[PDB]
Amino acid sequence: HMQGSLMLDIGGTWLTAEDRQILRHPEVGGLIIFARNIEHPAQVRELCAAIRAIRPDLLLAVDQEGGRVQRLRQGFVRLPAMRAIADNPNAEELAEHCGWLMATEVQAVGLDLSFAPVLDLDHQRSAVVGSRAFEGDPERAALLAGAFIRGMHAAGMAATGKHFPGHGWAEADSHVAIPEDARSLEEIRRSDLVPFARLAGQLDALMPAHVIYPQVDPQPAGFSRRWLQEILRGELKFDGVIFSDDLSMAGAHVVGDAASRIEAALAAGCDMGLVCNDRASAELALAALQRLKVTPPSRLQRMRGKGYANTDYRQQPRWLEALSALRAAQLID
Numbered sequence: 263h264m265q266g267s268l269m270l271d272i273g274g275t276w277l278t279a280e281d282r283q284i285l286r287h288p289e290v291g292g293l294i295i296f297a298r299n300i301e302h303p304a305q306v307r308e309l310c311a312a313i314r315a316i317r318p319d320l321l322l323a324v325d326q327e328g329g330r331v332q333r334l335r336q337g338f339v340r341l342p343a344m345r346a347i348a349d350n351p352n353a354e355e356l357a358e359h360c361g362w363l364m365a366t367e368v369q370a371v372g373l374d375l376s377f378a379p380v381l382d383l384d385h386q387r388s389a390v391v392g393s394r395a396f397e398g399d400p401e402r403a404a405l406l407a408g409a410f411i412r413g414m415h416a417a418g419m420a421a422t423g424k425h426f427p428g429h430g431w432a433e434a435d436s437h438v439a440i441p442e443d444a445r446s447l448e449e450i451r452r453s454d455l456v457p458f459a460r461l462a463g464q465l466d467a468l469m470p471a472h473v474i475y476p477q478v479d480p481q482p483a484g485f486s487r488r489w490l491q492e493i494l495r496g497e498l499k500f501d502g503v504i505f506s507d508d509l510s511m512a513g514a515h516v517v518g519d520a521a522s523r524i525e526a527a528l529a530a531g532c533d534m535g536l537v538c539n540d541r542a543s544a545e546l547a548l549a550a551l552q553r554l555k556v557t558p559p560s561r562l563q564r565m566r567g568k569g570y571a572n573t574d575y576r577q578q579p580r581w582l583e584a585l586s587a588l589r590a591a592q593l594i595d
């Protein structure tokens with residue numbers, strides 16, 4: 263009667279026999295890679311193909327926006343930070359070139375999508391979105407992110423928005439602490455949420471933050487049916503998938519058990535649960551999804567990469583023009 267899925271995580275260069283046996287479960291619908299899973303480009307290509315040899319229906323994602331955190335390093339251009347593009351005069355063109363460049367480079371390795379860009383605003387308040395946020399003005403960041411997403415769509419990758427409904431004002435970090443944002447209801451509509459409302463029709467995937475808004479819903483935004491159903495789906499006209507954020511870090515312990523985390527996330531309206539950095543918590547969630555007999559949402563296949571990317575992306579006119587256009591701003595490698 264309900265729908266949902268699970269995105270796993272491996273902690274090795276190649277697949278362990280245990281990883282193969284947990285993949286085959288239908289409730290698993292994705293895999294996130296980190297620094298510990300990456301050696302060289304060809305290594306990641308055979309790692310993907312090794313997973314596709316088990317489940318060609320899975321979708322593989324990477325944490326690659328090119329700033330403080332860029333997982334794919336050797337063999338990949340040093341993408342700039344989103345704040346490094348704001349000062350430049352033609353930011354609307356550098357965004358399209360930056361989005362297309364990184365999306366083609368990661369799709370040619372084998373991954374489907376990349377959790378990028380971030381739609382948060384740089385209020386100089388949050389320690390996690392330092393250089394990740396585009397700019398401070400809401401409309402400036404909404405136009406820049408729309409151009410960045412425009413480049414990814416031209417590359418064939420579905421874009422994911424982070425982090426709904428806003429994480430730049432939350433002074434506390436959600437990786438170790440529990441962020442709380444006591445801003446009023448109507449102010450968020452005029453400030454942090456503006457980029458999310460502008461790109462709701464141009465976006466295919468969202469990631470709610472784990473910040474608490476006591477004005478809106480005592481539970482975090484990822485676990486709030488008022489945030490995900492009443493405001494996002496019912497008001498912001500959004501219709502794509504809703505990727506849960508990492509359900510293993512701190513800030514998500516408001517509900518309790520690892521299994522109870524994905525219970526509250528799927529009951530809130532999200533389409534997929536994200537648990538990484540811990541295999542045991544992923545097994546408890548998997549066993550949970552097997553119990554209520556989750557069905558893979560028909561919206562998830564929209565996020566699989568349609569990329570025409572081969573090893574050919576090195577020889578295309580967009581490749582040379584975007585290289586020169588981004589090299590002029592002293593951003594790329």
Ligand SMILES: CC(=O)N[C@H]1CN[C@H](CO)[C@@H](O)[C@@H]1O
Nearest residue numbers: 325377390424425436507508
């Ligand atoms: C708030 C935040 O930045 N969360 C990150 C947690 N880890 C995920 C998997 O790498 C990322 O997608 C989120 O950005």
